[PDB]
């Protein structure tokens, strides 16, 4: 299935995921599209914030859902 | 060292920090990885709520010692 | 694969405007914060400004406030610093840097990547 | 504001000397310092990131340490190629703040 990803700035890329997927590994597909780190990746699904531990199954993710890309500014 | 930070909904929010690091540091780093601002924030360990200007050996808050996050609004 | 090209910096008389640019490679500016330093002659680094260009969050130094117009154009991945009203004590080679993620998890970010920095000459 | 405060001002160590600078903190900062090596006549190069954590490219014998508002720079072999100015770094409060610096001059 895949789902979409959209950013602040306008860009939306969707993505060809898995329910079983962590949230880590639908990250690092990210940054194979646009570059932009893990660590510094933010996923929002319905208002929740998406833990980097646990599959998008455990939030129940379903196909064409929306995520939306918040990026950190200090790390840490 | 990590620590978790856990709210009323269920979430778990795991963080690398310091045992020097003061609680406004901590709560620093969940405004930059979660958002919510550090005036929402209110943190709760072993029932005592911790004041802003102590470092968390102040509170001997080990390793993979959780806390708890309620929001101000 | 990853490079930040300056240009802009001159000679300019006090009073002046210049337009220091930043051309970027190797990654998105749409996506990762840009900061500019100066060091005078003789002395240390100075932080000048920054961009959030995610958020479009600037910030600047009470040095350069009023005076300095940072700015971020995402269509040519570029990163601009308009400086008016030029002083003698902006004389300083002004460096263009990226703050972001630096290899490790869990770590705070950090100036990774400079550029070869250009100079601002401010004299009559 | 948050201002460093580096110690000292320029070290002078012969070839395989370990040199440690200290940088301390006005306000309290957690682990946001990095260090950075300005080799005369190019731009500075990132050296040890997040208090303590080694940048990619840069030698071993470079090291970073926190303890509290106090942060330590520390060459294990120092090299010819090490004269250059040290300047820690202050990435927490958005009015980014840098050490005074430190010369290191070989002694021979």
């Known amino acids: 299935m895949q789902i979409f990803v959209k950013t602040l700035t306008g860009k939306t890329i969707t993505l060809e995921v898995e329910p079983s997927d962590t949230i880590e590994n639908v990250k690092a597909k990210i940054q194979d599209k646009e570059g932009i780190p893990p660590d510094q990746q933010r996923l929002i699904f319905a208002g929740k914030q998406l833990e980097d531990g646990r599959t998008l199954s455990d939030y129940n993710i379903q196909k064409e859902s929306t995520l939306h890309l918040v990026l950190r500014l200090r790390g840490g | 060292m990590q620590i978790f930070v856990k709210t009323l909904t269920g979430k778990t929010i795991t963080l690398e920090v310091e045992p020097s690091d003061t609680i406004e540091n901590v709560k620093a780093k969940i405004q930059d990885k979660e958002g919510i601002p550090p005036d929402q924030q209110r943190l709760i360990f072993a029932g005592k709520q911790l004041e802003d200007g102590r470092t968390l050996s102040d509170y001997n808050i080990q390793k993979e010692s959780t806390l708890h996050l309620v929001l101000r609004l | 694969e990853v490079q930040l090209v300056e240009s802009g910096g001159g000679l300019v008389q006090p009073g002046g405007s210049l337009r220091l640019s930043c051309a970027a490679s190797?990654?998105?500016?749409?996506?990762?914060?840009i900061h500019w330093v100066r060091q005078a002659p003789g002395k240390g680094l100075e932080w000048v400004a920054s961009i959030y260009s995610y958020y479009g969050s600037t910030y600047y130094a009470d040095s350069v406030k009023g005076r300095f117009t940072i700015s971020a154009d995402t269509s040519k991945n570029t990163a601009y610093l308009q400086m008016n009203s030029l002083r003698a004590e902006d004389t300083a080679v002004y460096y263009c840097?990226?703050?972001?993620?630096?290899?490790?998890?869990?770590?705070?970010?950090?100036?990774?990547?400079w550029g070869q920095g250009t100079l601002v000459t401010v004299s009559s | 504001d948050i201002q460093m405060t580096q110690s000292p001002s320029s070290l002078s160590a012969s070839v395989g000397d370990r040199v440690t600078i200290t940088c301390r903190a006005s306000?309290?900062?957690?682990?946001?310092v990095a260090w950075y090596q300005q080799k005369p006549g190019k731009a500075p190069k990132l050296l040890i990131y997040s208090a303590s954590s080694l940048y990619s490219g840069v030698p071993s014998r470079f090291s970073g340490s926190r303890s509290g508002t106090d942060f330590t720079l520390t060459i294990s072999s120092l090299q010819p190629e090490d004269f250059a100015t040290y300047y820690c770094?202050?990435?927490?409060?958005?009015?980014?703040?840098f050490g005074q610096g430190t010369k290191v001059e070989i002694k021979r």
């Open positions: 770094q202050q990435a927490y409060v958005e009015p980014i703040t």
């Open positions: 306000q309290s900062v957690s682990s946001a």
């Open positions: 190797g990654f998105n500016v749409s996506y990762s914060s």
């Open positions: 840097a990226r703050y972001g993620f630096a290899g490790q998890p869990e770590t705070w970010y950090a100036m990774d990547y």
